[PDB]
Amino acid sequence: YVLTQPPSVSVAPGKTARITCGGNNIANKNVHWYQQKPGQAPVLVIYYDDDRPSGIPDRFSGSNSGNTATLTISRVEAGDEADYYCQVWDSNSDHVVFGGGTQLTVLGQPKAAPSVTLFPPSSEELQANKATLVCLISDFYPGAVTVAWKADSSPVKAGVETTTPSKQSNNKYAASSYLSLTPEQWKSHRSYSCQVTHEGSTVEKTVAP
Amino acid sequence: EVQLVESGGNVVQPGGSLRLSCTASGFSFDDSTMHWVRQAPGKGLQWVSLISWNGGRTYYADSVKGRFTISRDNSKNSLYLQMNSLKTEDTAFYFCAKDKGDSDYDYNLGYSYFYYMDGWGKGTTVTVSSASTKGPSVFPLAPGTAALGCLVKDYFPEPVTVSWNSGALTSGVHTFPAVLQSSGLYSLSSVVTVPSSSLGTQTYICNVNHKPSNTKVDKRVEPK
Incomplete structure (x- = not known):
C-alpha cells in the first residue's frame, strides 16, 4: 500500500496550512499524523482521523475521503515548523505504512x-x-x-x-x-x-x- | 511520566550482528504492544516490526524478514531486536514505540486491531560500514569581506568537531554537515567570513578534533 505526500509546503504566520496524504479508498483506513521536529522524538498530533490528544491545540484537525486525507493547521506559529508523517495500518500484508513526509516552512x-x-x-x-x-x-x-x-x-x-x-x-x-x-x-x-x-x-x- | 530509553547500537561490519534493548517505565508495560521503527539519516520513518502485549502476534517488515527477530520480556519491562546478516542499508536511527492496543472484538465477525503509536523514545544510532576508524586530512582553504577555512576530509566514523583560535573566534564561524564519500569516508568544512582589511594583522588557526582516533590537527590559514 502506498502513501504519497508532498515534499514541502510554505505558509505565513497567520494563514492556515493544508497537507495531503492520499491512497485508494483510504477512507477504509484509520489515518494518523505525527510531528517530528529536527532532533527530538516524533509526536502524535492526530489519530483515528479526527480524534485529537489533549495538549494538542485546537489548531489541529483531520479529514479523510476518497483518495486523499488531509491535515490542517491554523493560526500557524513559528514553533510549528517541522516534518509531518501520515500513518495507517494495512490488513492484507500486516504492514504499518508511512508517507514520504512534508516540511512545514513558516516564513518569518x-x-x-x-x-x-x-x-x-x-x-x-x-x-x-x-x-x-x-x-x-x-x-x-x-x-x-x-x-x-x-x-x-x-x-x-x-x-x-x-x-x-x-x-x-x-x-x-x-x-x-x-x-x-x-x-x-x-x-x-x-x-x-x-x-x-x-x-x-x-x-x-x-x-x- | 512516560519514558523509553533505547540502547545497544554501535558500529557493525556488513555481515555481523547486533541486539538492541529498550527500557520502559511509567506505565503498565504488559498492557501494551511495542514497535520498532527506524529512520535513515535525514530520511523518512520506516516500520520494522511489532509485538503484541504477550507475543500472540508479531509481524516483520518485508525487507527485514529472514534477518531480524523481535522479542520481549514483560517481567523486565524490556523489548528486544536481534539483527543478523546486517547490511549497510540497515544503517539508521532506531526508536521503540508504544501502542494502546485498541481493537474491536467480534467472535463470529472477525478480530480487527488498530495500530497507532502514542509514545516515542529518543532512539539509538546504528552504523554499518566496512571502513576502519581513521584520522582526517586537513587542507587549507585560503582566500568588502572574504572567506577562509579548513577542508577536513577522509575520516571515520562520526563525529568531528572544529574551532578557531581555541574557541576565541566565534563570530562568522559556521561548521558544516558531513557528506559521505563513495569510499565510506566522511568529509566537511568550516568557513569563517572576516573583514578583508584586517588580514596580515590577525592569525586564523583551524583547531580540529577527531576523538574516535584521538587526533588533533592545527592548521593556520594565510592568503595566497
Whole structure:
C-alpha cells in the first residue's frame, strides 16, 4: 500500500496550512499524523482521523475521503515548523505504512539570495596527488538550492556530493558541494564552474588552473 | 511520566550482528504492544516490526524478514531486536514505540486491531560500514569581506568537531554537515567570513578534533 505526500509546503504566520496524504479508498483506513521536529522524538498530533490528544491545540484537525486525507493547521506559529508523517495500518500484508513526509516552512524572514564562493585544489592536496573543488553557498533564504557542476560548458555529474541546507547563526541558510578530480583531469580541462540555482536565479562562480 | 530509553547500537561490519534493548517505565508495560521503527539519516520513518502485549502476534517488515527477530520480556519491562546478516542499508536511527492496543472484538465477525503509536523514545544510532576508524586530512582553504577555512576530509566514523583560535573566534564561524564519500569516508568544512582589511594583522588557526582516533590537527590559514 502506498502513501504519497508532498515534499514541502510554505505558509505565513497567520494563514492556515493544508497537507495531503492520499491512497485508494483510504477512507477504509484509520489515518494518523505525527510531528517530528529536527532532533527530538516524533509526536502524535492526530489519530483515528479526527480524534485529537489533549495538549494538542485546537489548531489541529483531520479529514479523510476518497483518495486523499488531509491535515490542517491554523493560526500557524513559528514553533510549528517541522516534518509531518501520515500513518495507517494495512490488513492484507500486516504492514504499518508511512508517507514520504512534508516540511512545514513558516516564513518569518525577508527572503534573501545566495552567496557562492568557489575554492580550488589547495597547494598541499595536489602534492598528495588529489584534487577537490569546494563550492560554498551561504546567507540565503529559504533553504532550498540546486547545484550543478560543469567543465568547459559540458555538464558534469560523475563524482559529486552536496550537503543539505542548515540554519546558520543569523538564522539564514547555507550549503556545501564538493567535486573530486584527479590532478590529471584538473589539468586537461581549462575551467570548472559551480552553478547554483535558487528560486529561478542562477548565481555562478568559476575557477581555472 | 512516560519514558523509553533505547540502547545497544554501535558500529557493525556488513555481515555481523547486533541486539538492541529498550527500557520502559511509567506505565503498565504488559498492557501494551511495542514497535520498532527506524529512520535513515535525514530520511523518512520506516516500520520494522511489532509485538503484541504477550507475543500472540508479531509481524516483520518485508525487507527485514529472514534477518531480524523481535522479542520481549514483560517481567523486565524490556523489548528486544536481534539483527543478523546486517547490511549497510540497515544503517539508521532506531526508536521503540508504544501502542494502546485498541481493537474491536467480534467472535463470529472477525478480530480487527488498530495500530497507532502514542509514545516515542529518543532512539539509538546504528552504523554499518566496512571502513576502519581513521584520522582526517586537513587542507587549507585560503582566500568588502572574504572567506577562509579548513577542508577536513577522509575520516571515520562520526563525529568531528572544529574551532578557531581555541574557541576565541566565534563570530562568522559556521561548521558544516558531513557528506559521505563513495569510499565510506566522511568529509566537511568550516568557513569563517572576516573583514578583508584586517588580514596580515590577525592569525586564523583551524583547531580540529577527531576523538574516535584521538587526533588533533592545527592548521593556520594565510592568503595566497
